[PDB]
Design a protein around this ligand. Sequence first.
Ligand SMILES: NC(=O)[C@H]1O[C@@H](n2cnc3c(N)ncnc32)[C@H](O)[C@@H]1O
Lengths: 240, 197
Amino acid sequence: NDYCQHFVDTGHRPQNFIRDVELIRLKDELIAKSNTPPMYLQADIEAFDIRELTPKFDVILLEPPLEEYYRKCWTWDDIMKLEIDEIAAPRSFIFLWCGSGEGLDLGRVCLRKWGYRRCEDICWIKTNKNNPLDPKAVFQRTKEHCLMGIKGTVDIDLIITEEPEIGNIEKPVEIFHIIEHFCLGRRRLHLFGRDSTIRPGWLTVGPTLTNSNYNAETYASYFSAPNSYLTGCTEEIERL
Amino acid sequence: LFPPQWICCDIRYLDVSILGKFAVVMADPPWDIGTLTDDEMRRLNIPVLQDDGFLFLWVTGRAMELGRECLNLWGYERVDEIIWVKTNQLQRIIHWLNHGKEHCLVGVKGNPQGFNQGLDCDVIVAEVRSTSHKPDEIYGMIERLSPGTRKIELFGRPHNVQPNWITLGNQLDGIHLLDPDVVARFKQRYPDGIISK
Ligand SMILES: NC(=O)[C@H]1O[C@@H](n2cnc3c(N)ncnc32)[C@H](O)[C@@H]1O
């Protein structure tokens, strides 16, 4: 009945007991067909003029390495000074991983600073089925937030997975499925991605990448006419 | 004085100074997303209700941002955020995305001492009942956090009244007060038993 009391008694988080955590295959397949080749660039983002990332992006996924993930780190001071508005398309979206502490407030300041308004709060809820603490915390923190913002004019706002091993900072790959299922456009940027997050249909930029293949001219050539306004969910436009 | 107490009122106009100080405030306001305007929410006399303690503030939609504003304007710092995952009786979850959850901001004011922080986690999993009816689990979380203390709920309905809580709301049935200090201040302020203006 009362999973809160049960957690106090046994250490099993209430989310451990959520159960069950059609033609979507075709959609997934069309997304795969219109995906650009993976592109990636090693860049030390604090020292790197982000304006050289072109063209302007339809989707930005921002995953700064917060100090709270470890228990080089980026403070919200650092993050807030990123020039995200300079590379976002006039109509575009952002997904910003905010953690579970002050980022929930400071990430909203960022979004507004960069011209976005929040349209969704996506919660990554962490179960502890296999293994049943900020001074300001009132409660044990068992989830993280990814804020979705929009500028200009099937899935649920919950991701439930088991808490990863200590020292593992990866976010659930399910966030990419949610993003790509929105069909927001094909210019997709993942800032602070890693070798392990490189993915078709995305440009990944981060300090720990071991290799790069990014070329602005080659990258822009994927979105030249007739393919400038595709959503990433439609059939490709035929040639010769 | 320990058993449930409540006051049917318009929370905009009640002189909440007569109620004293509380270790915990909880509110489920009718955000303008019968509503209260943003300015009416901002003007609510929350600051007089506590010196040191915690505020629990349910939010949704643009109130996720407006509620942070009110919280800060009222003198709180947001230190936590509870997520209620909504399920049917079989523990299955019920614009761009379909919503499986509701949010409750946790603000702190002053320096609360002797609370049992960290006993519960920040996720609630509980069955949906009537509309806008929040889960009863929150009362047990709040009781474990701050046992035996005075607590006050704003915009509560009859099913919200609980021991150690005073409930305010315009769909409650009359006035039911037992704490003699509160009874005395209420009679002093409202001798004829009416709360207008
Ligand atoms: N969840 C809700 O909206 C609850 O708050 C009540 N309410 C709406 N405006 C007010 C008000 N100015 N003063 C006191 N209570 C109110 C609603 O009648 C409902 O009981």
